[PDB]
Amino acid sequence: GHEYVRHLAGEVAKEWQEEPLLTLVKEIVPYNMAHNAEHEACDLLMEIEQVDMLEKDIDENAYAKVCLYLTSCVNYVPEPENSALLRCALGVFRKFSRFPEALRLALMLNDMELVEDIFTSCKDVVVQKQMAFMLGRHGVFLELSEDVEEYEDLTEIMSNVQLNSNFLALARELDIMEPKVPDDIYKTHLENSARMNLASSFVNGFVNAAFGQDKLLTDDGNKWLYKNKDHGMLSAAASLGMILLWDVDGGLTQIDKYLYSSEDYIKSGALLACGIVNSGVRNECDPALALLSDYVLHNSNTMRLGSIFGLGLAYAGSNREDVLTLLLPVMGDSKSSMEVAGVTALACGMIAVGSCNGDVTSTILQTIMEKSETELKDTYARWLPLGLGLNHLGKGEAIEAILAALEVVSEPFRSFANTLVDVCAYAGSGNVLKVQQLLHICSEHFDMGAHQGVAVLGIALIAMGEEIGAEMALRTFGHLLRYGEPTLRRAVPLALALISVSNPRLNILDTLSKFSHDADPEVSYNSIFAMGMVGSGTNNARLAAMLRQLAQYHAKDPNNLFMVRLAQGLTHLGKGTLTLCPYHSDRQLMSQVAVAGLLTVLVSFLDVRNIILGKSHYVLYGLVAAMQPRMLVTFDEELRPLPVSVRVGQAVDVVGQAGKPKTITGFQTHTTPVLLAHGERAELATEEFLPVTPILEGFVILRKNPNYDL
Amino acid sequence: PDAASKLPLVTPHTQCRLKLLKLERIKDYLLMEEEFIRNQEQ
């Protein structure tokens, strides 16, 4: 009897927590495999904690269902069951020679040795090519050995040196090579100062990002570059490197003209542009380390400001020893201002994000200790914990000692640093206990309440792991905005932007539009920038209409108008071909570099009045670290483009129900060089080709199906 | 529909550990919401 054995398995699971039991489970599990009730068998081993021998009893016809069920349960179970579940599912995948999806789980585990072992064990060169594509998208690089066959192509794929050419191939394919002037975004003719020039420079950088062509800077841009004034003249030059993103040869050619300027602002903006150009792509000759290294100890603080941030963006998520050893002494330098120390913290955190680097942590802690309380009152000091927090991004319980080291620090900076590092350690984990602690922090009303904004941001930074926590945190953010103190509610728009970046869902956009025209100027700026961030790179027509209406409303307010222009530039990022979402591979893999960049921008937005609206708007270029293309290329065995027919539609959960359910709904058929919106999956419409990886995102390699045309 | 009380759609429909975990996450966030609101109202 099926019901009797189900009840027996339930009773066995109940009494295990309280010899023949092993025989009972070893007989029940194959039955559930036979009668297609895989998830009940998975629950059995999950309860009695013997998921080890579940692998031995898996057949070819059911590995996908058990793997998907085990992986989907990880986001909602705490440690140490996360590691056990990931390793069991990875072992099941490896036993079945499904190398790409095993590498996905290894990247989830953040086990570098396991990733290298999976990459090396596979014998299929094409499968290794696809896995190198996933590694390059994730920002993970393996130092392969020379005896490995096809070393050059594998390293080139992992280093993303071909990303720029493929992106330009898309742009030519979608005939969107034409540059867009910021006036095309503003559409001021339909409407019935240095700040606006800086806003237009930022829009010009955002819209034409990674395209390499521009009607306003690739021409004789000295007129436009000098049209800005003072520190805005900093960012415009840096924007010139944003158009040439991922193009470390052409971009550095177009930036070198500005490296000879007698003006410090243009020179350091161009240094930051050189750093931006090298972001993502991993060149072997290290051009960014060659150009920006000589200006990290310059007399001018602007020289250092551009150079350190450029080097951090270029080598973000790399954990390079040479760059870190070159950047660490900048913190303790006497001539380094608190701005330079904060930007050094940001760069060092971005370079060694999620690596728990000992030198970075020790140097940041020493810098924090040496600063006096009056110095710690400076808001740029807030970047020091962030670089520390980025050092331990997603590590979890590895910050306790660091927390102890932070106990001696004086308040209120001690509370701010503690909250920031505690949040960063549990980023993308969904730990409801940590979110409960953050809500406890946000509960107490109060200078004194600086860390409350960080706690509000951290609620989103933890709940971003999966959709259930995301929507629940949306409700929590509504409550915080209703009941919070003004310092509490100035960060809620930033949390909304973080939790739904490049995902312009209607409810969040409406919530931000309600608070866009708010009495408090800071929450208004944050709400407008969050409207820009939420629909960043989506080319949302409705969001563009709201932003144009806001520009009409905020015409007389320079700060609000600047924020509106920034949001408009973000909405049309990369002409709709780029995304800032830190989650890829069906929103299951968290890119530490993207999270680092988003944090660098959003935490700095907690002082939008003095940082973003002041002389430090260049920190917006941290979004470059999070700039990835919403990609779908099908390549042949020799990496040449292969136009194929695919069906693109909103992703549908498959776990649970049996059969072969449709994974997409409301789909349409397009040729493969197409852009995927957030939450949109793509599947091969025909059976002519077999993808190397199940996930049809980024660069995908297709093989000829022998069964087709039998 | 019911506006504020739109809860996320839990999957799968079949009763299993995964659905229990998703529903418990929803319950945890609702409990945290209740605590926060009861603290802020007073």
């Binding site: 730990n431 409801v432 206990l433 | 319950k27 409990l31 945290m32 605590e35 009861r38 603290n39």
Partner: peptide, 11 residues
């Protein structure tokens, strides 16, 4: 009031 007992801390 009293710390709400979440599912995780129930152990």
């Amino acid at each position: 009031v009293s710390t709400a007992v979440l599912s995780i801390t129930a152990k």
